[PDB]
């Protein structure tokens, strides 16, 4: 969810995924195919969805984190200063990045659990597995 | 500490001066009192005490300063600047200078 | 090295207009025989896309 302390406000720009493997931690994973701003509540939706589906275990790895402040329209204005810090927190996610990875659950127990999570996401995704050895 | 030699050495602003450097290794009872030209990595004069001192070790103080002042004067070395190690400029070392200052 | 101005200088960046001026080409169709020196070959590479190069 939100971060503990920081600077307050930010900016915005885009280009292809930097630090996001495929394996590590889990067996199966979920990968972004489009660039986006993944809201805090958007992840918190996916966690809850996958969490419920597995019942007991909690073997879900949330690789993405909302390390980004977004501002908003108090009511109308423009005549006046910079805008409200407290709209939402976001994680900039570029194609290739692993957002979520699952452990111990079966192939299908994961195909479906991720399918449900996809429906709570603002972008196209795909499920992944093994053969990713860069560093371990 | 060791910072003392590099402090005294760096403050002896090398080729800006034009003048020659006068080293002293007063750490032992065997000097080196070398005359080093800043520019070329070359030593011009130099007067030690290792081979013959006449018995003296901290007493040879002026002798080796007087020896060098004479040794330099042959080559025509007139303009020079002294550089101590961590040496406080007082006894064995102050003599070598006061003997060169008076010895030409 | 035969060079001819085939595209217009209008809407093209300053430097490219200035190069096409140095190369002595004033109209479209304008052709000239050129030096095999690195700077004169260098001018011809700057405005390559505006010229038709024979050899």
């Amino acid at each position: 969810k939100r971060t503990k302390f920081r600077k307050q406000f930010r900016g915005r720009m885009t280009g292809d995924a930097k630090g996001g493997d495929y394996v590590a931690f889990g067996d199966y994973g979920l990968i972004a195919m489009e660039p986006a701003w993944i809201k805090s509540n958007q992840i918190e939706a996916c966690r809850i969805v996958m969490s419920r589906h597995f019942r007991r275990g909690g073997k879900i790895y949330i690789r993405i984190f909302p390390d980004k402040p977004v501002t908003k329209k108090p009511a109308e204005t423009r005549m006046g200063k910079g805008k409200g810090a407290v709209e939402y927190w976001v994680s900039v996610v570029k194609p290739g990045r692993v957002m979520f990875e699952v452990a111990g659950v079966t192939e299908e127990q994961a195909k479906e659990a991720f399918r449900l999570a996809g429906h709570k996401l603002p972008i196209q995704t795909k499920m992944v597995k093994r053969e990713v050895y860069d560093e371990a | 500490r060791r910072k003392l030699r590099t402090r005294r050495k760096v403050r002896t602003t090398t080729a800006a001066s034009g003048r020659l450097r006068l080293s002293v290794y007063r750490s032992s009872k065997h000097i080196y009192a070398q005359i080093i030209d800043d520019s070329r990595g070359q030593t011009l004069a130099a007067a030690s005490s290792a081979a013959l001192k006449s018995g003296n070790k901290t007493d040879t103080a002026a002798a080796v300063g007087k020896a060098l002042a004479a040794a330099a004067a042959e080559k025509g070395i007139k303009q020079v600047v002294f550089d101590r190690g961590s040496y406080k400029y007082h006894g064995r070392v102050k003599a070598l200078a006061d003997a060169a200052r008076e010895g030409g | 090295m035969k060079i001819k101005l085939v595209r217009s200088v209008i809407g093209r960046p300053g430097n490219q207009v200035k190069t096409v001026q140095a190369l002595g080409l004033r109209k479209i169709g304008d052709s000239r025989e050129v030096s095999d020196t690195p700077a004169v070959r260098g001018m011809v590479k700057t405005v390559k896309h505006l010229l038709e190069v024979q050899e």
Partner: protein, 84 residues
């Protein structure tokens, strides 16, 4: 006069005219005095025949030709190698 602050928190108009940088580069015929660098600390330290002003500014002592010495990075020097 109310109990609220004399100075209102959260501003941003604040900034300053500001200058700086290198004035003479590697391979330039300088006259004596000609400033070679404007700097904050000692990005470039004074070399052979180059003086350092109060504000770490580097000026020429004698006419010549500017040579830059980049000792591995962290220790940098500007010196003059006269044409005469």
């Amino acid at each position: 006069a109310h109990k609220k602050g004399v100075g209102s928190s959260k501003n941003g108009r604040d900034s300053n005219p500001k200058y700086l940088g290198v004035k003479k580069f590697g391979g330039e015929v300088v006259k004596a005095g000609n400033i070679l660098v404007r700097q904050r600390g000692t990005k470039f330290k004074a070399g052979q025949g180059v003086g350092m002003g109060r504000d770490h500014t580097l000026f020429a002592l004698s006419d010549g030709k500017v040579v830059f010495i980049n000792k591995g990075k962290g220790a940098r020097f500007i010196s003059i190698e006269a044409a005469q």
